RNA sequence: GUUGAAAUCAGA
């Protein structure tokens, strides 16, 4: 359960963070890490989600709807997580060696990095999404193939999330989990839409209660829930 | 983890 909090310090003031940063944070960690440990960088780039990171966290903020999130605080925070402590250790080094980050017009500077004290998981957990959760299927639109994104109110959601976690689990943990069952109940739910590169990915910001396989619970906690976790999706905080 | 949240919403 290696999880870090990277602190970011905004150059200048009246700083405005753009709404869609996913691809830019992803590709910048991917390079920084590639310089230090090319071998791990290939894990970060995998479709299978060997790690997750969160929304850029701005504690004191206000919404400017056509521009972005104004940072009224001194600092913002990124939370990176992974079940593999080699990945976490490499990201921490690489980011320290190349502390500059550019997002849109803005530029940050990596401040203190902190390992995070992690509460233990029970039989039943209440999770909250730090980055939205993505579950995709495929559909024909006319003569074209389309990503079609699912939300928890969709009938196929639970079915596809099970399948994606079991599949992800086997690839990154190496074997299938002994216990393949779980159910989740949605407490609070909001839809969101991110532009990553050329495309739009839709997902779920949500609070939910998980019940089920202990090995899957702990996998999603560390590597994120759902798909595209590598692009900063599906990361969850644990709560009471 | 002071985000129980953060605009936009099927895209040519």
From Swiss-Prot:
Gene Ontology terms: biological process: defense response to virus
InterPro entries, sorted: Cas_Cas6_C (IPR049435), CRISPR-assoc_prot_Cas6 (IPR010156), CRISPR-assoc_prot_Cas6_N_sf (IPR045747)
One MF annotation (Gene Ontology) recorded for this entry: RNA binding
Stored Gene3D superfamilies: 3.30.70.1890, 3.30.70.1900
Keyword terms: Antiviral defense, RNA-binding
Top-level taxon of origin: Archaea
Family: Belongs to the CRISPR-associated protein Cas6/Cse3/CasE family.
Subunit and partners: Monomer; homodimer when crystallized in the presence of crRNA. Varying the crRNA sequence varies degree of oligomerization and structure.
Database matches in NCBIfam families: cas_cas6
Protein purpose: CRISPR (clustered regularly interspaced short palindromic repeat), is an adaptive immune system that provides protection against mobile genetic elements (viruses, transposable elements and conjugative plasmids). CRISPR clusters contain sequences complementary to antecedent mobile elements and target invading nucleic acids. CRISPR clusters are transcribed and processed into CRISPR RNA (crRNA), also called psiRNA (prokaryotic silencing) in this organism (Potential).
Protein name: Putative CRISPR-associated endoribonuclease-like protein Cas6nc
Native species: Pyrococcus horikoshii (strain ATCC 700860 / DSM 12428 / JCM 9974 / NBRC 100139 / OT-3)
């Amino acid at each position: 359960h290696m999880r870090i909090e990277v602190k970011l310090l905004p150059l200048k003031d009246n700083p405005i963070l753009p709404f869609n940063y996913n691809y830019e944070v992803y590709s910048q960690i991917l390079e920084k890490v590639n310089s230090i440990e090319p071998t791990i960088a290939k894990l970060l780039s995998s479709p299978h989600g060997f790690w997750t990171f969160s929304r850029i966290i701005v504690r004191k903020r206000k919404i400017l709807p056509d521009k972005g999130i104004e940072i009224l605080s001194d600092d913002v925070s990124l939370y990176i997580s992974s079940s593999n402590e080699d990945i976490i250790r490499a990201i921490a080094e690489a980011v320290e060696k190349s502390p500059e980050f550019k997002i849109g017009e803005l530029s940050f500077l990596v401040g203190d990095i902190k390992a995070i004290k992690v509460k233990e998981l029970g039989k039943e957990n209440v999770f909250s999404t730090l980055s939205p959760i993505v579950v995709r299927t495929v559909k024909f639109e006319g003569n074209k193939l389309r990503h079609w994104d699912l939300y928890p109110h969709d009938e196929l959601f639970m079915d596809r999330l099970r399948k994606v976690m079991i599949l992800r689990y086997s690839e990154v943990m190496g074997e299938t989990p002994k216990d393949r069952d779980f159910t989740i109940e949605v407490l609070k739910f909001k839809p969101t839409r991110l532009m990553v590169g050329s495309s739009y990915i839709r997902g779920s910001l949500m609070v939910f209660r998980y019940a089920g396989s202990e090995e899957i619970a702990r996998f999603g906690y560390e590597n994120g829930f759902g798909e595209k976790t590598g692009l900063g999706f599906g990361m969850v905080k644990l709560i009471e």
